[PDB]
Amino acid sequence: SSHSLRYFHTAMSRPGLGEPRFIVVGYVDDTQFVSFDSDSENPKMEPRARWMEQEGPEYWERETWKARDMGRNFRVNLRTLLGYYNQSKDESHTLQWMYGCDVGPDGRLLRGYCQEAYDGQDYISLNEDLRSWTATDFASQISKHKSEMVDEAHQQRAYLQGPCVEWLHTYLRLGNKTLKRSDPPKAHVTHHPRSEDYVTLRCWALGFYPADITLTWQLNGEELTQDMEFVETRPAGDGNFQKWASVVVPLGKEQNYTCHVEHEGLPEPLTLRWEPP
Amino acid sequence: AMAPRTLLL
Amino acid sequence: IQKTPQIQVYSRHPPENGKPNILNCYVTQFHPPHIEIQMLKNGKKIPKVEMSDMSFSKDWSFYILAHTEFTPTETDTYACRVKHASMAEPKTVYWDRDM
Ligand code: NA
Ligand code: NA
Ligand code: NA
Ligand code: NA
Ligand code: NA
Ligand code: NA
């Protein structure tokens, strides 16, 4: 019964336009709770969840300042890597940073993450021990050496083991009604005649949270693992998620197929068939 | 809250 | 270096002809992050389409949710048109109410 606090940072240079754009989004589990975007006039760290309005002014001002300064460092980093690689300014380049903590039911750290990518590829990563770095090419070897020199691992490890865990506990408390809601999917099967002989049965899962779900189809108890089509789980836009899964079946045989739904918010799994009337 | 600093590459 | 966007076009609530609703365009698995997203009603660009902040996946590829208010009817057409460096031309994906 775990939870996670995660931040996603992106700097993207725009050749012809101005300075690189810097974007931050922060998540508790599947819920976006804060953001920052340097394309805003007078850009600030912003709440993306209503319950984050409980953090007072000092929180927002300190996070804004950190973000702004971090954006500046991402800009320096972009210039540094252009230099390592002798690349053109006519192309845009992208630097990404993801870090965070997973905590178990006991509130203790299960694992910490801290990793960067340049132009969509792994550049440097903090190893699971939170003490050593894995580099990729010899540009990232240089970066690794510099981080070893300023004992960067110690600073990131200390954050991930202490404040990351504590802030996760705080946000879980502040946002408990939203964050612990376990909204089960409301499910139904729809019917779409396909070719006079065949029909599509589509099983719907709507308004659920968290995103993790299983939505499966069976023919007389046999799992249709080779036949079933499904879409990626997708946000409704309101904090909940959606999914569907479908099978093509012989018209007049629809009764033999079942949709099966599992989710944290369902104490028992759902079994559904297409209801004609 | 965010990491106190980022890597200098 | 370059990954091709996947697109889903769908309503927030189950679609009912005449009732106000929200149309979503969920654009995922692309890189670089620069992308152009337009939502269309009967071939015309919809003004006031909000973009919900650009996050990313385990493979570093980007995802974003474009959304706008809409009111479906029996004959109106809605689409999402996406322009991205990985694609030669823009890809248009029409809203299907059963999807
Ligand atoms: Na959870
Ligand atoms: Na900017
Ligand atoms: Na970190
Ligand atoms: Na949660
Ligand atoms: Na960095
Ligand atoms: Na981001």
Q: Return the closest-CA partner of residue A205 out of A245, A248, A256.
A: A245
Distance, in Å, from the CA atom of A155 to the CA atom of A48, rounded to the nearest integer, reads 28
Own/partner contacts of A23-29, CB < 8 Å, gap of 24 or more, are A23/C53, A23/C54, A24/A67, A24/A70, A24/B2, A25/C53, A25/C54, A25/C55, A26/B2, A27/A100, A27/C55, A28/A3, A28/A4, A28/A168, A28/A171, A28/A172, A28/A175, A28/A179, A29/A3, A29/A4, A29/A179, A29/A210
* C60 with A37: Cβ contact below 8 A: no
Place of tokens 């670089």: C32
The encoded tokens of residue C59 equal 């493979």
Of C1, C8, C60, the CB nearest to A231: C8
Mutation for A interface: C55, C57, C59, C65, most A CBs within 10 A: C55
Structure determination technique employed: X-ray
Distance, in Å, from the CA atom of A54 to the CA atom of A35, rounded to the nearest integer, reads 16
Residue C63: domain span: 1-99
Q: Specify whether the CB–CB gap between C22 and C12 falls below 8 A.
A: yes
Q: Is the dihedral of CA A152, A153, A158, A164 positive or negative?
A: positive
* A237 with C67: Cβ contact below 8 A: yes
Distance, in Å, from the CA atom of A139 to the CA atom of A137, rounded to the nearest integer, reads 6
Number of domains chain C is built from: 1
Question: Residue C73 is part of a domain; what is its CATH number?
Answer: 2.60.40.10
- CA B5 to chain A, closest CA, distance in angstroms equals 7
- Does chain A touch chain C (at least 3 C-beta pairs within 8 Å)? yes
Residues followed by a break in chain C (C to N exceeding 2.5 Å) are none
For residue A27, list chain C residues with Cβ-Cβ distance below 8 A: 55
Torsion of CA C22, C23, C29, C30, to 10 degrees: -110
Residues in chain B: 9
H-run or E-run covering A34? strand A31-37
Dihedral pair phi/psi, residue A233, rounded to 5°: -55, 140
Those of residues 9-28 in C touching chain A at CB distance below 8 A are 10, 12, 14, 22, 24, 26, 28
Please name which ligand lies nearest the alpha carbon of A95: 5
Domains of chain A: 1-181 (3.30.500.10), 182-274 (2.60.40.10)
How many C-beta atoms lie closer than 10 Å to residue C53's C-beta? 17
Q: What is the stated resolution of the deposited model, in angstroms?
A: 2.0
For residue B6, list chain A residues with Cβ-Cβ distance below 8 A: 9, 70, 73-74, 77, 97
For every residue of C43-72, which 3-state class applies, written as one string? CEECCCCEEEEEEECCCCCEEEEEEEEECC
Q: Specify whether the CB–CB gap between A17 and A26 falls below 8 A.
A: no
Of A81, A124, A159, the CB nearest to B3: A159
Of A74, A142, A155, the CB nearest to B4: A155
* A125: amino acid identity, one letter: S
SS3 A200: strand
